Amino acid sequence: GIQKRFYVSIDKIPEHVINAFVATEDRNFWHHFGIDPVAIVRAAIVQGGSTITQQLAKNLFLTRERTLERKIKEALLAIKIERTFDKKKIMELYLNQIYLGSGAYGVEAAAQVYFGKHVWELSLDEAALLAALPKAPAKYNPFYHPERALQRRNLVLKRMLEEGYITPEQYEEAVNK
Amino acid sequence: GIQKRFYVSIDKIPEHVINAFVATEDRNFWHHFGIDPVAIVRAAIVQGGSTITQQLAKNLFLTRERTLERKIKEALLAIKIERTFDKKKIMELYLNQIYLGSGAYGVEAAAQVYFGKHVWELSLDEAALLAALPKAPAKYNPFYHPERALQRRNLVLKRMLEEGYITPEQYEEAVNK
Numbered sequence: 001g002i003q004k005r006f007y008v009s010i011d012k013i014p015e016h017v018i019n020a021f022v023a024t025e026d027r028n029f030w031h032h033f034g035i036d037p038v039a040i041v042r043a044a045i046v047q048g049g050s051t052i053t054q055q056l057a058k059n060l061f062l063t064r065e066r067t068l069e070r071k072i073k074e075a076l077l078a079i080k081i082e083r084t085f086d087k088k089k090i091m092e093l094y095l096n097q098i099y100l101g102s103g104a105y106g107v108e109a110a111a112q113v114y115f116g117k118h119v120w121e122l123s124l125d126e127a128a129l130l131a132a133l134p135k136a137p138a139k140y141n142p143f144y145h146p147e148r149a150l151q152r153r154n155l156v157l158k159r160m161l162e163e164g165y166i167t168p169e170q171y172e173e174a175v176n177k
Numbered sequence: 178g179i180q181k182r183f184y185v186s187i188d189k190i191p192e193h194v195i196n197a198f199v200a201t202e203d204r205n206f207w208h209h210f211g212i213d214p215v216a217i218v219r220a221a222i223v224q225g226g227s228t229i230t231q232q233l234a235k236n237l238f239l240t241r242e243r244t245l246e247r248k249i250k251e252a253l254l255a256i257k258i259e260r261t262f263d264k265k266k267i268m269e270l271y272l273n274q275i276y277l278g279s280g281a282y283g284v285e286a287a288a289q290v291y292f293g294k295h296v297w298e299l300s301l302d303e304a305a306l307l308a309a310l311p312k313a314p315a316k317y318n319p320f321y322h323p324e325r326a327l328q329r330r331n332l333v334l335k336r337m338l339e340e341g342y343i344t345p346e347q348y349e350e351a352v353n354k
Binding site for chain 1: 181260
């Protein structure tokens with residue numbers, strides 16, 4: 001098996017993990033149609049970028065190209081995908097394919113590599129750490145950059161708090177874990 | 178909802194339906210890697226064509242193009258998909274997106290439109306009918322071409338028999354339903 005090991009359906013994935021990934025990478029994921037116009041504009045201002053669906057598309061290309069052309073092929077695919085499968089399913093696929101450093105593909109493989117346990121056994125702070133990796137697994141890998149990894153984790157937590165996915169009490173406890 | 182209505186996970190889909198689709202469209206689906214070299218060659222001889230994974234890719238393009246270029250973009254996607262998700266999952270996705278005529282997308286929407294019931298409530302002969310549609314939903318639609326639809330159904334049954342997915346007794350009973 002290439003790395004197609006450890007697939008877990010959406011219904012067995014913690015609300016905290018889903019929310020951590022949404023708040024951090026595509027805050028308005030549940031409502032757009034593949035691409036986020038507002039996000040794209042609000043991005044120009046100050047970060048920014050793609051939607052979860054786009055990141056999923058980006059990884060369906062056998063090649064690792066980044067031209068402007070490819071970015072459009074991604075957004076078109078993203079849009080078509082959104083017309084074919086629902087949000088919970090897209091979230092499921094995305095979460096199980098995403099590279100999270102240390103040879104870990106998907107939330108499950110990650111939960112074990114980083115916390116010796118199952119994704120559904122993860123705490124809030126443990127979920128926040130996974131969501132902080134996608135941006136750059138190698139730059140924020142807790143194994144050798146526990147410092148950048150840590151602050152980016154608390155940043156995800158701060159994001160989740162702003163989205164209302166967790167309470168202030170829940171926030172204070174997590175950032176100190 | 179566009180048509181993203183009626184999604185059913187692989188584990189709730191009858192062995193007869195899966196097998197009917199495999200035997201008919203990608204006999205050696207469980208063992209290839211996205212494309213089937215032997216199938217492609219054995220195809221030239223006498224039919225032939227793509228793998229289930231390829232058909233899935235073909236439908237992730239917002240456009241309905243058929244150039245040689247697009248056929249290659251499909252096979253590359255197919256190959257990448259196979260390296261990302263396992264067979265049972267690919268089968269799940271494919272089966273839920275495939276157009277089967279009469280506005281029906283996926284096996285579920287099909288089971289209802291054609292047999293007023295749920296995919297898991299389908300009989301062997303009912304499963305054989307669904308597998309006969311992908312080739313040309315409009316050419317074999319039971320609603321207006323019950324004649325072509327019928328013989329192609331029995332052809333799927335004959336295929337399933339040859340693959341050993343059903344017994345001779347099971348075959349005789351179905352072709353007469």
